[PDB]
Each structure stands twice: as C-alpha cells, then as structure tokens.
Motif scaffolding. Sequence first.
Motif, PDB file in Angstrom:
ATOM      1  N   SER A 151       4.970  46.836  14.760  1.00 10.02           N
ATOM      2  CA  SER A 151       4.136  45.801  15.413  1.00 10.02           C
ATOM      3  C   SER A 151       4.755  44.480  15.875  1.00 10.02           C
ATOM      4  O   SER A 151       5.884  44.230  15.742  1.00 10.02           O
ATOM      5  CB  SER A 151       3.321  45.547  14.031  1.00 10.02           C
ATOM      6  N   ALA A 168       3.231  41.269  10.725  1.00 10.34           N
ATOM      7  CA  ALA A 168       3.833  41.975  11.929  1.00 10.34           C
ATOM      8  C   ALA A 168       5.293  41.659  12.035  1.00 10.34           C
ATOM      9  O   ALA A 168       6.100  42.823  12.431  1.00 10.34           O
ATOM     10  CB  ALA A 168       3.453  41.158  13.299  1.00 10.34           C
ATOM     11  N   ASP A 191       7.024  44.572  10.254  1.00  8.76           N
ATOM     12  CA  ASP A 191       6.644  45.878  10.495  1.00  8.76           C
ATOM     13  C   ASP A 191       7.419  46.020  11.786  1.00  8.76           C
ATOM     14  O   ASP A 191       7.433  45.575  12.817  1.00  8.76           O
ATOM     15  CB  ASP A 191       5.160  46.029  10.656  1.00  8.76           C
ATOM     16  N   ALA A 192       7.971  47.230  11.935  1.00 13.69           N
ATOM     17  CA  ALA A 192       8.940  47.542  13.065  1.00 13.69           C
ATOM     18  C   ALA A 192       8.106  47.976  14.204  1.00 13.69           C
ATOM     19  O   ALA A 192       8.515  47.602  15.577  1.00 13.69           O
ATOM     20  CB  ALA A 192      10.018  48.665  12.705  1.00 13.69           C
ATOM     21  N   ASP A 221      11.134  40.804  18.728  1.00 13.72           N
ATOM     22  CA  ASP A 221      12.197  41.850  18.327  1.00 13.72           C
ATOM     23  C   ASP A 221      11.186  42.673  17.389  1.00 13.72           C
ATOM     24  O   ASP A 221      11.977  43.704  16.939  1.00 13.72           O
ATOM     25  CB  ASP A 221      13.508  41.249  17.478  1.00 13.72           C
TER      26      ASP A 221
HETATM   27 MG   LIG Z   1       8.292  43.727  14.178  1.00 12.52          MG
END
Ligand SMILES: [Mg+2]
Lengths: 250, 225, 195, 204, 244, 111, 241, 231, 243
Positions: free
Chosen positions: D180, D174, D177-178, D204
Amino acid sequence: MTDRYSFSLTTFSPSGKLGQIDYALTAVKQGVTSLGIKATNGVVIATEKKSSSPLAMSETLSKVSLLTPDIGAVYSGMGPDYRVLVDKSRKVAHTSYKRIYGEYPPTKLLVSEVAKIMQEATQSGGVRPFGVSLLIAGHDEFNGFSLYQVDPSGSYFPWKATAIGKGSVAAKTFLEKRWNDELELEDAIHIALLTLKESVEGEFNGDTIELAIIGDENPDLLGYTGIPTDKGPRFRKLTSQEINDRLEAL
Amino acid sequence: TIVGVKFNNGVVIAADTRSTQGPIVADKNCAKLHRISPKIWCAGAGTAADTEAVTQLIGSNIELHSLYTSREPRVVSALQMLKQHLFKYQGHIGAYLIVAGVDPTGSHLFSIHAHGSTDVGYYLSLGSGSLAAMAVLESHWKQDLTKEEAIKLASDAIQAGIWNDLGSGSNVDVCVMEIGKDAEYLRNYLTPNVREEKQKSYKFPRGTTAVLKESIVNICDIQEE
Amino acid sequence: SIMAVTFKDGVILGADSRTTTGAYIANRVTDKLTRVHDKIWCCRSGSAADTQAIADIVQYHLELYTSQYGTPSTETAASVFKELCYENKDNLTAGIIVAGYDDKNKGEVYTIPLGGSVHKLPYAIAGSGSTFIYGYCDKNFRENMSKEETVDFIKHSLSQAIKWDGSSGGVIRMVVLTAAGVERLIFYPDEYEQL
Amino acid sequence: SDPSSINGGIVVAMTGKDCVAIACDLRLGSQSLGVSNKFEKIFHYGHVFLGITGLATDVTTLNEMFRYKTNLYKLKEERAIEPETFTQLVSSSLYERRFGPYFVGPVVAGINSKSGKPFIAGFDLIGCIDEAKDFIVSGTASDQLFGMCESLYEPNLEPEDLFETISQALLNAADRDALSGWGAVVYIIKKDEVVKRYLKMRQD
Amino acid sequence: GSRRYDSRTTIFSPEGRLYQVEYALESISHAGTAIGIMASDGIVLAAERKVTSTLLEQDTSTEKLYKLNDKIAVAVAGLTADAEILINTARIHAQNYLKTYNEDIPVEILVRRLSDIKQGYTQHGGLRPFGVSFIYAGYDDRYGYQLYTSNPSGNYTGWKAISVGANTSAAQTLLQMDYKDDMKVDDAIELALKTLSKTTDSSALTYDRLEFATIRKGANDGEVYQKIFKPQEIKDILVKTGIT
Amino acid sequence: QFNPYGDNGGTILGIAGEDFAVLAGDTRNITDYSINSRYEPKVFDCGDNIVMSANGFAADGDALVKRFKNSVKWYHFDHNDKKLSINSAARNIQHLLYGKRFFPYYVHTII
Amino acid sequence: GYDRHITIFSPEGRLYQVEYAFKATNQTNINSLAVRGKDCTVVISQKKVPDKLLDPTTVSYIFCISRTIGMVVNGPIPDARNAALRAKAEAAEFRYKYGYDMPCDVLAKRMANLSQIYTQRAYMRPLGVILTFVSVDEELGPSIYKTDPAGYYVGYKATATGPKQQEITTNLENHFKKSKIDHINEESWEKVVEFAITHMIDALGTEFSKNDLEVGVATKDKFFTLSAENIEERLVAIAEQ
Amino acid sequence: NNYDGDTVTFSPTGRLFQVEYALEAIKQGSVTVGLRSNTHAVLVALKRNADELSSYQKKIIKCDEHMGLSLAGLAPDARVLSNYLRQQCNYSSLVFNRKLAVERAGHLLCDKAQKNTQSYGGRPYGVGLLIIGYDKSGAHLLEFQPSGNVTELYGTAIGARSQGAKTYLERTLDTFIKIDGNPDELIKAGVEAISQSLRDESLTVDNLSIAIVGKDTPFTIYDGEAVAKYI
Amino acid sequence: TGYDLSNSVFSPDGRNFQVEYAVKAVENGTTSIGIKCNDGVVFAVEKLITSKLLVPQKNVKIQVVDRHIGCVYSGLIPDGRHLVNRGREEAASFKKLYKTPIPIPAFADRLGQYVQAHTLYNSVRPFGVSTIFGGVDKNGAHLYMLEPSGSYWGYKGAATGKGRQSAKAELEKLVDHHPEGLSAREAVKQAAKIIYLAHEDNKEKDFELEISWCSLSETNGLHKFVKGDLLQEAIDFAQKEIN
Ligand SMILES: [Mg+2]
Ligand SMILES: [Cl-]
Ligand SMILES: [Cl-]
Ligand SMILES: [Mg+2]
Ligand SMILES: [Mg+2]
Ligand SMILES: [Mg+2]
C-alpha cells in the motif's frame, strides 16, 4: 404434444385495429364496476362484491388484493385472469426488485412490471390477452400517493380519480364534479361510497361492498415491535362494520 | 453464540453481536437475529453472507406463500424450505441456524445444520460459543419456564459465550415470540461491554496533514442554461 | 445403535438418542425412529442430513402411492428406500432399517446398508454400536417372541450397545407396530444401565 | 497466488458531524513491482461513493457494473440512488457470484439526500454487510487501519477535523504495509459539497 | 393441427408489401402527432397527448416522451406498451456500449440496433410487429445534433425536421415551408408548437394536452442538457409564443 | 480408485508373403499371475479376406474387432456389396481408434 | 369463425370453448350436493349404473385426494380422473415442500389457476368438469370449495352441482333462511348425511335405494366414503321418522 | 374431403384418408410376389424402368444374412424402413448375439409406421413391403402396409395388378408349401405366380428380379443373366 | 360448424366429435370380448380369415402386459399395439420403483390417463381402439374396458367391435343365470360360444378363434393362451351350441 402455437393470436387488421385487445376491452366493459380516488393523505379503491350465489361465502372471494404492504389492487372484467395477475404481480415485486434492492418497489415501477406481463400476452405466441383492467393504488417515499389504471394492451395511465367496468362513463362524470386537490382521505371514502351506490342494483352494505385504502402506516398490523424504521403497512382493507358506520353518515 | 429457549406460552431466541474475520473483529454490534416472517425469527451462525441470504430468500418465499394461501406462515414451512435448500448445496452454503416462532399450530423451536439436518428441542445452542452456552442451559433449564425465566436463561447462556468464547462478544440481542401476541425484538437487550473513556484525545491540529491538490467534485446532474 | 425385531403380534423398532459432531453430543434426545406411513416406520443411521432427506422423500412417495393405489406394503416402502440409496450411493451415507406391519404379511423387517442392497430379516441391527451386540443378539433372539419378551430383548441389546459405543447413548426409544395400533415407548438411563 | 493481495491497496471510510469521509491509496502493483501510482479506488454514482480494494481487474469490472446498474436505476426511478439502497445492491450483486466471487473488499460512503443522515458500510467478498456507525476499513493493511481508526477516531467530528483524522489513519497504516501507499486521495463529503484532496506521502 | 389458426404475420403480398407492417402503420396514423425539429444549437421534441381527461394526473404522466440516456431521447407514436418494451431494450443497449467502450453510444448505433429488432419481427418468428414509430433526438461528438425516425418495418432515416403519428402529411408540408437551415432552438420551439396547433384534431391546443422536451448545448460550457418540460413550463411557453 | 484398463497378456504375429499372408497369436488369456483360459481365440476372420487381432486389454480388443466386423457389414450395405480392400480397412480402423483418442482402446492391432 | 374453436375472445368478449366446456359438465346427468356440519363436511352424489355388465363398485365420481381432502366431480370420467390425479400430485408435493397438509381452499385455488391457464393458452383445452373439494380444515373448519372450467372458484356454506342444481340450491337456500346459520347444527356426521339425503329427496322428488347414492364424509384428520351398507343404515333411519 | 388435410384427422365414418392415400401409392407401384415353403422363402419382383435408355429400378433390399424385403411404392420410404430393419437386426446380433425373429421384425415395423399416423406434422410411409426370412422357427413371409398392419402369410403379392398373382397362390397353396429342399422349383412357382399379373409386357433378362433365403441359404439377390434360367 | 375438423375442440353440445369419430373406427373392427370368472378373467377375439394364404394361429392379436395382465382390442390394430407398448412401459416403471407387479385398477388408470391425454390437443389424434383388459392381482380378479375418450369402468363381462350388441346380450344372460359365479374352465367355453354367436355380424368371411385367460387356480395368476386340446374342446362346445 408440444405447444405448437408459436405464432401470434393477436394481429393487426387492415384498419389498424388489434382485434383481441378490443375484444378484451369489451369483456372489461361487461365486468362489475370498480373505482379509485386519490386524496391528499391517501388513496381509496372500491368495488361491488357481486355474489354468484347466496349460498356462496363472498368473504372467501377477494376482489381487492394486497400486492405489497403499501400497494393494493382492484379490477373489472374476468376474475380468474385477475387472480393469476395478482400472483405474478406479487412474485415480480420480489424477484425483480426486493431481492435486488432490499425494499419494496415504488407504485409506478410495479405497475410497469404488471403492464409488461399484460403486453406480452398481447404479442407472444399461442396466448390471448388478459381480459381485465386493473386499478392499482399505492404509496412510496419519493413519489407519495398514486393511482394507476392498467389495460389489456399493457398501457397504463396515472389518475387523480377514475372508474372502470359496467357504469364507468357515468361514474367518471360523477367523480369529475366532486373531486378536488384538497380532499382528505375520509372525504374520498365518502365520495367513493356515493359513486359506487349509483352502479349497484340490489343490497348496498358492508357485506356486498369491498373497499380498501392506502393511507397512514399501521403499526398494529405489522406483527412485531423493536425496529423504529419499520412502521407497518399503509394498505388496509376496511371491515364490514367500518363500511356500515360510514353508510349512516351518507 | 446463539440460543433458543422454549417457555410456557411461547419461545425466545438470543444472540451475541460480534462478527469476526479470523482473529479480527469486523463488527462490534452485528445483528444476528433475522426476521423470516413477523412471528418467525431465526438466529444464524457460520458464514455470515450465507445466513443472511438464505434467510432473506426463504423469508421472501414465505411471504409469497402466506399471500397465496391467505394464512399466517408456519415455522415447519420455513424449516422445510431451508433444509431442502441447504441439503441441495451439500453444506457449501455454510448456514447454521436456530429457527423459532409462533403460528396457528403453536410455538416451535428448531435448529438447522448446513448439510440439511434439523433438530427439535426445548433448548438449543449453535456457534463457536455453543458449548459455553449449552453448559448453562443444561445446568439451569427446567420444564414449565415462565417468559421472564426463559429470557434470563437465554441471555445468561449468551453471556457464557461472550465471556468464555473468543469468537463471541459485545452485546446481547433477544427476540421473544409469545402466543397470541406481537413478537418483541429486543436489540441490545444487554450492553455489558462498553469501551472505557480514552486517556487522551487524538484530534489533530488543522493543517497537520500535507496536501498536494484540492478540487470540487461535481456530484450534481448536468445543469440548465 | 438401532434395531428392528419381528415377533408374534407384529414388529418393534428400537434406537438410542445420541447425535454427534466428533466427540461433542449435538443432540442427546434425538428421534431416530421416523414414520414414512401409518404402520411403516424406519430406523436411521449414518448422516442425519442424508437420512432425513431420504425419509422425507419416501414419505412423499408413499403418500402419493396411497392416494392412487391404497395402502402400500412394507416391501414396497423398502424398495423406494433402496432405489434412493442405490442410485445415489456415491453421494450418500445412510444405513436404514425399514419395519412395518400388514394384516396379511404381519411384521416385516428390511435392512438397507451403505451400498443400497436390501435384506429381509427376522430382526436387524445397525449403526456404529451394533458391532458390540452381534454376539448377544444372535444368542438371545428367538422367533415368535411375546411383546414383553421382545421389548426386553431390545432394551438389553441397546443397553450394551450404548455401554460400549461412544457414539450411542441417551434414552432408548421404541416403536411398537401391531394390529392394535402404534405404541411409543421410552426408557431412561437409570432403568437400562443397571441391567 | 492469493488474489486479494496481488495488486495491493487500501480504503477507509469515516463518519463525522453531518459529513462522511472516504479515502484510498493510489498504488497498483504486481506483487513486489510497483506499476501505477495513479490507480484510484474510489468511484461515485451520483452522491453515493464506493471504494473498492482487492484484485484490480475486479475493482475496474465492478465499477463499470455498478455504473451500469445505477444509470438504469435512475432512468426508471427518476431519482438518484441512496446509500442504504446502493448498499443492498452491492450485497445482492456480490452474492450472485457466491461460488465464483469477485476478489474485492467494497466500502460504501455517502449521505442520505432526504434524511441528511451520514452512512457508511463495508462488505466481504461475497456480500455480507458491515454497517458501522464509526468507521469501515478494507485492504491489505486492514489490520493496521483497524488499529489506527480505533485509537484516533472520536464521534461527531467536523469536516476539517475529520479530514486530519482519516488522513493520518490511512497514511500511517499504509507506511506499515509493503503493498500500500504510492500516493493517497481523501474525499470529504457534505450534503451539497464534496472536496477531494491528494495527500503528500512517502513514495516507497 | 395448429396451422389452421396461424395468421402468418411475416409474409409478402402479391404486390411485394408486408401486410402486418402496412397495417401497423395504419394503426400509428391514428396516434397522437409527434414532431421533431433539429436546429444548429439544439433539438426540439413536441408531442400531443390523445383526448385526455380533467381527472388525469398530468405531472406524473408520461406517454409520449422518454429518456434513453443523458444524451438521447425519443418521442413515441403508437401502442405505448409496445414502445416501453423497446425503450427498456434501448436503455440496456446504451449501457452495454458504455460498459464495453467506456464512451456514450453514438446516436445512429442505438437507432440501428432498435431498428434491427423491429426488422426481425417482420422476417421471422411468426409474431406481430411492434405497432410503434419513434422519433430519436440525440447528440454525440461525431455528428453533433441528430434526428432519426424508425417504423415497424425496421427502416430508419435521418431528418432536419420530421413528424410521426396523425396528420403527418399536413404537418410535414408546414415544416417544409417555414424551416430554414440557420434556425435556432427558440425559433424551432415556436415552429413545433405552431405546427401542432394547426394540425391538431382538438378545438384548441392547451398545456394539459402536450408533452415537450429540448436537447440543448445550452448547458454550462461544452456539454448537453435534456429538459423534459413540466406542465407549468409548457403553459408558459404557450403564452410566450402567443398560442394561448 | 477404479482402473478401467487391464492386461490380458498374449502375443500376436503377422507376416506377409508374396501371394499370401499369415496372422498368428497364442490362445492364452491371463490376469496378473493367473490363467483365465488356455484356449481363447484372439485372431478373427472379419470377412472380405481380412484377418484381424487386437492384442492387449481383451475387453477393448473384442470391442474393436466387433466394431470393425460391423463396419465391413455396413460397407456392403452402403456400397453395393463392394469388397473392402485391405488399405481401405486399415484407414477405417485408424478412424475407429482415433475416435477414442482421449479414452483409448488399449490394444496393439494387426490386420 | 375460428374464435369458437380455440380460447380467444369473440367480438362480444366471450370465450365460447369455456362456455361449451360448462355444457359438457352435465353430460353424465348426475346431481351432487355438499353441506357442512359442526365437526364435518358431507358430500352426496347420485350413482347410476345403467349397464348390468358393469362392476358397480368401480363406478364412482368421488375421489380421495389426500387423507384430509375429498373431491366430487361433475362431468365426464376421463376429465374427472385427469383432475383427480393432478390434485393428488399437487397435494402430495405441497406437503413435501411446505411441511404441512395442503388446505382444501389452497388446492381449489391451485386447480382453478391451472383451469385459468387453459382458458388463456390456445394449445390446451379446458376440462369439462366442475370440481367440488371438501374437508375439515385445521384452521377454517368445515370447508366446501368449488372450481369450474372458467378458472373461477369460491367457498360455500353449502352447494349443489348438476342438471337439477337450481332445485337443490333453492331448497338449501330456504333451509338456511329459517335456521339463520352457516351450517347444519348437528353433532354426529351420521345425522348430517341423513340431512343431505333427505333434502336431496325433497328437492329432486325421487326416492333412493342403497345403490342409487354415493356418499363422502370429511371429518378432522380424515376423509372417507360410505359403503352401500353404511348408506342403507342411513336410509333406514330417514324412513323411521 | 374436409378430413384429408393431415394424418391427425379422422373422418365422420372413422377413416384416415392420408393413410388411405398412402395405401394408394402402393397400388400404383410395380408388382412384387412373395411365397414360401417349409425350407425356403422366395421374393419375386417385376422391376420398372423410366424408358429404354434408363435402368430398371431395384425392388429388393437385403436386411441381414437371414432376412430381406421387396418394395412397392415410394422407394425412398423403403430405404428408410429397410435401414431401420438393418439397424434392428444388427442391434439384436451385437447385444444379444441373436438373429432377429421375422415376427418381431414385423412388430417393429408396425410400431414405427404407426407413430407417423397419429402425430401432427409428419406423414404416413408411402410404401408396402414384403419381408421374407429364415429364423429359429423356420421360413417366414410378412406383408407390411404403411397403415401399420403387418400380416404373416404363406404367400402374397402387392402392387399394380397384384390380385392375379394372389389368386394363383390361393389355388396353388397346397402345392408350393410342400416344395421342400428344392429352391429352383419354389422360384419357378413364384415366377409363374407373378406372370399372372403381367399385361402386354413379358419377363425379360433385365426386367426380372428374384431373391431367396432358406435353411442353408443366406439371403441372396439374383439379377441380370442370373435369372435367365427362370425366364 | 367446423367443430369436428379438429381434436380437443368442444362443439356447442359440449362434445368432442373427433373422439366420436374414433368410436366409428372401433365399431368397424372385429369382435372382441372379456369374461370375469370366479378367480380370474378370460379374453377372446374374432380373427377374420381374409384369405387361405393367412397362416393359421400365427397372426396373434391378444397381447400380454407384464406377466399377469392380458390385453385385447377392436378397431385400428396398430393403435392398440401402441397403447400396449405404453402399458408395458407403465407396468415396468411401477415394478421398478414399487417392487410389486402393477395392480389391475392401477394399470387401468395408466392407460386411461394416456388415452385421455390424446383428447387434449389438436396436434394428436385420438386412439382408434376400445381395449378390453384385466387379470389377477393381490385383491383378486379384475376386468376393464377402455374407450377412445379415455373412459373406462370395471366389468363383469365386456364386449366391443362389430358384433358387440349380440355379445352383450349373451354376456347379460350369464350374469343373470350365474349370480354365485362362473368357473374359469366354464368361462373359456362360454367365451368361445359368444364369439361364434357374434360372428353372425361378420358372416361373409369365415374366422379363427383365439382365447386367453388368467386364473388363480388354473394358471397360477399368470396370463396364458388357450392352446391344443383345451382350445379344441371350446371350439367343439361352441359349434354344438350354434347347431
Ligand atoms: Mg508501503
Ligand atoms: Cl436426526
Ligand atoms: Cl398456482
Ligand atoms: Mg455411550
Ligand atoms: Mg517500496
Ligand atoms: Mg385453449
């Protein structure tokens, strides 16, 4: 043309009777005797192969029919009505269940679907009720072995043992004396043959009797090997020879 | 990579076990060998959901047909029902199949393209590894093969796909359909791609992960009393 | 490469055996000569799926025709093909040659190109490889040829079509239609390449 | 534009010894904008658990649909549905929308109440079943999850160990990954007890 | 043509009655008696199976009491096959409501929907009506515990205690005599069984000739539990109340 | 791709007097740079002292005129041979044209 | 008494319209017979051309349903042709959908199911015909399957239909009691046709000319009817022994 | 008796009573006469009023510039059938640029009426029509009955007391057929023919209705003071 | 009883009384005949002159189907027209799909199935006509006759209507006295005679003769009406024989 009979042909009479259903039950009464007995490790269904002519090959006419690998059916009443019900019953087991859940339906739910079809012929436009009573024996994982009766009205009842048709009143009395909750399958077959002999007039042998069981899984009848979870059909139709063997120990 | 090979007294089909989404392997042990009827099996390539669904549908209808006719199902019936279904959907159902089986008529082997074309043959191959497999079949196939020779040829053809095609991999499944016999499904007939032992264990110390809340989940039904 | 040729005793159908997906040969032993009735056969070109589906439907129509009205004519078979090809022209890619034998009409050939038009001819050629033998076939065809002459004509013609067309190849299949019956012939590369 | 990556999110499931685990992140967004950090993607119908990733409206819609179907199943069958059967019901239901599919990536997890055998499965958006022994992944960080699960996973883990493995697989995937993150939930499932834990992760 | 054979199921008599509805009610009056009693802390549903046999498999049998959802149940009086058609429709309707509003369906709304379906068969379509009378026992957070009845006419009414099927006249008199507003479930259980025991056409009331169910808030904290009684459990409550 | 419209050229002209009216039009019919006909009538007597022309795509113009002439015929049948006034004809033609709002008659009409 | 006009149950549990359709079956006053050989199935039927103005070639109650299946009908010709056209359509459709020739017994079942529907649905009347289907099936071998207005059907070793069916039936019954086999033990179909004609003559007690009979023969992969001259050759052989 | 409940039922003697009852409605209707020469064809119709305050019911309907009919029986049924003819005449003109043949117009009416006599639920038409017209084969006169039967004739009459006018035309056959190029004399013969069917009442200015079609004469109807000339 | 009140109802005999009642309408109609000759067929019909006001040669009864089939019928005329309209649709769709003109036996069954369909339901009435029809096809000449029940057979000669017995007797003589066959021109003459002889059953009103024929030699296998000199020649031959 067009089917202009969009109205009910079965209606309530002043006395509250549904005439066409009563008359359908009368047609079932005239029909040849068939019975079903439930054991601890199986279920047996049986009936007489009343041949219309000795020139006729009675093997080609199947009164006892496979619906699913673990469910079988027998009837009393009008044969043609039974034949189409079996066709519809087989199809509905796939369309309304197997194609959804990826497995065959349990006995009670398939019975419920057949019952529904028979109820609709009792209320829908331009049709008469089915002139048959069905006995449906079957097995499934969570409910175990079971035996159901289905009438022209669409009503269905579970039975430990029962009989329908010609000599049902006498046959049900015979079964009440013999039935117990500790019966093995072979004992139920023995009782089935005894009960059925009373209602038969002429020849009584493997060629004039039709008998099938819901019992152990038959891997030899599966047709393939390689999948451990697939162990074969529990429905098996007894051969002419297999019946005659048990008539010697009768 | 899927293949079909005819032999003396029957037919054999085989397949690899890799399932992919683009360059990613979704399933390392996928089952591409499907059962239409007890002695009629098919191998599918292309859109996975399509090959499964079209196989189950025709398998369902074949069972009902077999019950209606009181006869064992024929391969040409499954073939005809499949191609007519696929043709109707004009290739939008991306199912490419190799259909094989034995029936009262004899042993049969067919291929089916997604647009509804069928082909007959003694040896066939489909999928992204079909070229690697067909190169093997064209090099080693002969007339009057035995059961043992045909299984070898089939699995060799699948291996060609496993090693040389990136869309194919892992294991080799086989199904043998011989005349006058039960069909034998040989799941993971070959396993030449076992993962080696890892150098390290990544089992964590209990308490390593930070938690905020805990709670029991009620999965049971509403209770009595 | 497909063709059908009428001659003295009847008609002969001929075809190659190659099926392609781009430049890959998906089937090198294809049977493009297909039966719609005892002595009415067709040659298929274009989409394999379309031509199969069409031929299957036509066979169904002629089987039902036979049950009710007796043996259909070759012209009748061509009309059923046409009706399918013409009315579904937007969704089909099928070039079909229909050939049959009657006792009354003897050998007849009908070609049905893309649009769905029908053309009755002494002989017909079709498929991508037919382009290379228009000149050869026009110069070498004669009416009322013998069986052996007609076989040689088809063999030589398809040999050249196969030689030049990449989409054509494999074996040369032929079907002979006469009063005598139905004879299937086959000719392998080593035989026809050296011609 | 791509429906499967508008809202973002991930789900992962793992088998252990006489146990299964299923986990999901809590984010819901509109592309770059984070909207909700309480959007759970795991649901349960009796003892069968279902995680759904993809387009959030379809996630919500499918939950309501499978709740509908499992409730009727239970009334008629007089018993709760099992994971193997539910898996086929999901596949069936998705493929009936073959040419107008739900843009989702479902994941089934649970234990057969009769056999006691742990069971997980995954699907594509149109029904194809991926029945794996080890683990199943789904979402915008599926590549990341595949890499973490394939390296961290080992068979026959105990519940309290399996929790750490799946939690670390999710968390680290996660974080690369932007779309998630923004919280996470982990379900540890045993034959007759289920624990649900909310993880502390970077916001963030 | 076809007109010759049409019974005309949806017409008025000269007196302003619906023939088929009246005759359907006559059918239902021969069906096994079903009783519903509503208490302050729950609802009781009791029903008599019709002349059974010793060879009937009772533990897997269901002809009277059916479950519509977790909060609502029904007792049937009339044609069982007809009732199952409606029951499956009612089950679907409850699920549709749940999917739409994400809340369990209020009892009255479900009852009204089924009653509207029955009404339709009396006004249009030329089909015979459903020969069924229901007793609805249910709970929701608006009105709490509720008892309703519907009949083939499609008319429905609410009740504190009610009977359908055979001997309702005698049964309703007995309920009207012994029922009180501050009554509890355990007392209502006793009343239901005592009423059946007196109105029954059978020689004696036994466990094998009964179906029984309760809807109690007697569930762990603020929630509702449905209890369909098993044969052995019906046998025990018959001994407890002092009937056998 | 199939283009269902065409351009047959031509020009028409209507002028109203104090107690008369004229409707003029050239007799040329064309496609692209070719002449189809040097004499192809374009202005028609539609009955009830009404003249009409639908200029542009001839196939659409012929169809419209044909339909309006038919409208006049049925106006007589349905309303006791009443004369169709010019204002009533105009409103009727509006409905003929707008009835094909989403697949227009490609013409400029004058009566 | 409208329970006798449409197909609904009478108080006795009977369908009178079905029973009256059975009576229409004998309206033509024609008797048919079907027997099985080793490699063949033979069907014979009486041919009666009362009017001299009739074209006798067009008078027929035997139909070629498919290449393999033949059908003889006992009943009025309009209903007979109705059934024939439907059976032809069904047989053709079956081959198209399932890729192989429709078996005789499967067609019989299908036609029997259609007949059943007419006994249950009110707007459709039963057909007043008994359909006897014959073939040499590729799985079951020589086959005789017969359908009636009730929707009943069954396979037969041999069978007879018509006003004098019982006389023919008993004659056939007595033969199979002697031979103790389910067929006519004979190599050629020519001799099986001779058997069929001989036993019809014995049963009915009437002699036949070439124009008094109508013969249909089913062999492997084809069913065909005999011409008057083919039958004459058959009658000559019977007389010479 | 038992076989007149609907149109789908033959009687034991092979009769269709509902069709015969529809035929009866024509006999109750007011008289109308049709006749023709080689150049012209004429319709003459006796219109009927409800009372003295009421108008006289119109009997003649125009179908095209070259064709039209007179009615006797249910007027609404004549409106339906005349509307159908108008459409058929119109279809022939728009599609084939062809005036509909009078014989073919009769065939279309026959087939439309027939469908109503063989199907359940519907009913036969309750009106009789006399169609006149001038086409490419000259003048024509047809007689339509709602049984479906259409007949081409030199002259005829239908309605109440129509037998008197029909006998007159049968005598005058040789005379009026020769009346070519003289419309007024052909109408005179028609007015004299319909006069043989009158009792008590006589032909007044708002009672009489005449229509004519011919070689260079479009189908036109004459009513009011336009027929005073012929009284 | 009541079995005759509704179509498609079997009586206890196994009969459809409604169809039998339709036959009565046919027997009430005018006489029509058909004669099969060497290379074709001839049709003839009796047209009753109800009044002098009937235009001669205008009210045509015989109808053509396609270009090679002739149809004539006795009974309810509109019912016959409806049947021919259907026949024309059937023949058109056959030629559309199969190219060749519809064979006569094929055409006969199309009518047969359509008429038979009107004995299957109570929502329709049976046809009140017996139809004599036929023509020339690839296999030669064919003559058929079709009853209200849907029953049809091939015929050497056919007759129906009020004078059918008289006609049938005359047709039977021709079959006996001409085993080798009858020519087309002979058949036209004989047809005229038979109608004139059959007119004794409708002797109150005088009548008009109408004849048509299809012949391979005389009409190129197309249906044509007998007109002018050939018609008058047949009338003269017929008038000579009755005197
Ligand atoms: Mg993220
Ligand atoms: Cl191909
Ligand atoms: Cl069926
Ligand atoms: Mg080449
Ligand atoms: Mg951020
Ligand atoms: Mg019926």
